[PDB]
Structure 1
Amino acid sequence: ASPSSELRRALEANEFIPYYQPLSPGQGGRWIGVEVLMRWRHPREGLIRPDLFIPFAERSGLIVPMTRALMRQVAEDLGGHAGKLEPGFHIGFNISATHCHELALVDDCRELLAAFPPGHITLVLELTERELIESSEVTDRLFDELHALGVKIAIDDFGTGHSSLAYLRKFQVDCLKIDQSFVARIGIDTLSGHILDSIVELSAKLDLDIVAEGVETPEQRDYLAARGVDYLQGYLIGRPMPLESLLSSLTVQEGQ
């Protein structure tokens, strides 16, 4: 029994499925994008969330082909429904460290964007600060080519002081994520509020967009809107959903 051969079997059998989590403007309104999350629809185990297998797939050496297949499925799922997406609609992916160490990522992005009318979507790739600190000439070239396509880069797991500012500036990152762990402590923990304020301050300094994760309550939403946070995701906005559910909801929003 080979876990790595099982992952390859699964990939060939199209068991890795995109689930779509909506992003909302901080001030409310129609969804402005989705973040794509890879689930494994395992015939015996049921639906498995990515934190339960992505780390192993990275170790196995399979994460890039899996992410490529995911990007391909999203093009097939949404590229024929551009009329349901308001121009500029964001489509976000979590990109693994190994995918960042290659230039094939540029071609993967170029292909996904070609499935929609030019400029119609904004592709957003989410990386960690480690990918900026542990960078090389490949990184420099990758970020420059992706930016020239109109791809935007979002960063998680970052510092907020002048040392981190230098990396964010060098690579001309576009967005910061607010981790759910800070959002969950809005109104309950003073320090967390200070951390959140520090992230907002860095964003203002570098003119970055902010996506806040794990937004579950109206209190959290209003706190974050009060600080100009651009985009929200979490239970309040909606859980990750299968394509059928997304299309149903988009149809409704196009009608209003």
Structure 2
Amino acid sequence: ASPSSELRRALEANEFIPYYQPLSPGQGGRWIGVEVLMRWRHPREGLIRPDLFIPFAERSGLIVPMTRALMRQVAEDLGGHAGKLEPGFHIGFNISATHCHELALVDDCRELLAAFPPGHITLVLELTERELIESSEVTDRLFDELHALGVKIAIDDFGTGHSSLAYLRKFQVDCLKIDQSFVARIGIDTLSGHILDSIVELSAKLDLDIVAEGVETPEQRDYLAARGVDYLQGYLIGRPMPLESLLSSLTVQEGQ
């Protein structure tokens, strides 16, 4: 058996499915976007989460075709329901390091954006700090061309000192993610609060948006709102959901 061939078979069989995790404004209200997460609907194993196969998919060299197919499914899923999405609605993808080493990503983004009315959605790509530090002329060109499409870049796994500030400034990054591990320790751990405040401080310096992950309690939500965090996701807002569930909830939020 070849794990690599199994991944290619699954891709051919359309077993990699987008799940949509909602993003809420820090001050509450209607959902302002979704982050798309790739699940594997395996006929025998059931629904497998991406932390269990994406790292292997990256090693196999298949992560870019998988992500491309995901972006195409999202266009098909949501392109016809623009009237359920308030203008400016965010659609987020986790982009692998290999995807950032080639310019095809620009065409992938251009294609997804063409599935919606012009300017109707905001495409957000999530990268790690490593992709900025281990950059080349290709990176410079990529981010430039993405920014000209109106695509936004969100960064995770970053430092908050002047060293990291230089990279974030050079590449004109748009958003910072607060990791769930920090959010989970709100009200429990003083150091975690100081870290959280440092992230907020960096964001103010460079005028960046902040998305906080793993928001599960009203305490956490309120703490984050108090510091001006723009967007929240987590169990409190909602778990990643299949399209059918997303459309149902957007339909409700329409009417209200």
TM range (shorter): over 0.9
- Structure-2 residue corresponding to 1:139: 139
For residue 237 of structure 1, report the CA deviation from its aligned partner. Answer: 0.0
For residue 20 of structure 1, report the CA deviation from its aligned partner. Answer: 0.0
For residue 72 of structure 1, report the CA deviation from its aligned partner. Answer: 0.1
For residue 111 of structure 1, report the CA deviation from its aligned partner. Answer: 0.0
1:26-45 C-alpha deviation (Å, 9 max, x unpaired): 00000000000000000000
For residue 245 of structure 1, report the CA deviation from its aligned partner. Answer: 0.1
For residue 224 of structure 1, report the CA deviation from its aligned partner. Answer: 0.1
For residue 236 of structure 1, report the CA deviation from its aligned partner. Answer: 0.1
For residue 89 of structure 1, report the CA deviation from its aligned partner. Answer: 0.1
Deviating beyond 4 angstroms after TM superposition, the runs of 4 or more aligned structure 1 residues are none
In the alignment, the residues of structure 2 paired with residue 164 and residue 254 of structure 1 have an alpha-carbon distance, to the nearest angstrom, of 40
SS of the residue 2:76 aligns to: helix
SS of the residue 1:11 aligns to: helix
In the alignment, the residues of structure 2 paired with residue 122 and residue 113 of structure 1 have an alpha-carbon distance, to the nearest angstrom, of 8
- Structure-2 residue corresponding to 1:83: 83
- Structure-2 residue corresponding to 1:126: 126
1:53-85 C-alpha deviation (Å, 9 max, x unpaired): 000000000000000000000000000000000
Q: Would you say how many aligned residue pairs link Structure 1 and Structure 2?
A: 256
In the alignment, the residues of structure 2 paired with residue 165 and residue 33 of structure 1 have an alpha-carbon distance, to the nearest angstrom, of 27
1:152-180 C-alpha deviation (Å, 9 max, x unpaired): 00000000000000000000000000000
1:212-253 C-alpha deviation (Å, 9 max, x unpaired): 000000000000000000000000000000000000000000
SS of the residue 2:127 aligns to: strand
In the alignment, the residues of structure 1 paired with residue 33 and residue 95 of structure 2 have an alpha-carbon distance, to the nearest angstrom, of 17
For residue 143 of structure 1, report the CA deviation from its aligned partner. Answer: 0.1
Structure 2: runs of 5 or more not aligned: none
For residue 187 of structure 1, report the CA deviation from its aligned partner. Answer: 0.2
Structure 1: runs of 5 or more not aligned: none
SS of the residue 1:147 aligns to: helix
In the alignment, the residues of structure 1 paired with residue 254 and residue 120 of structure 2 have an alpha-carbon distance, to the nearest angstrom, of 15
For residue 126 of structure 1, report the CA deviation from its aligned partner. Answer: 0.0
Task: Describe how 1:4-83 pairs up with structure 2 within 5 A.
Answer: 4-83=4-83
In the alignment, the residues of structure 2 paired with residue 127 and residue 228 of structure 1 have an alpha-carbon distance, to the nearest angstrom, of 22
For residue 201 of structure 1, report the CA deviation from its aligned partner. Answer: 0.0
For residue 206 of structure 1, report the CA deviation from its aligned partner. Answer: 0.1
For residue 7 of structure 1, report the CA deviation from its aligned partner. Answer: 0.0
**TM-score, L = length of structure 2:** 1.00
Root-mean-square deviation (Å): 0.1
**TM-score, L = length of structure 1:** 1.00
For residue 47 of structure 1, report the CA deviation from its aligned partner. Answer: 0.1
For residue 19 of structure 1, report the CA deviation from its aligned partner. Answer: 0.0
- Structure-2 residue corresponding to 1:158: 158
SS of the residue 1:40 aligns to: strand
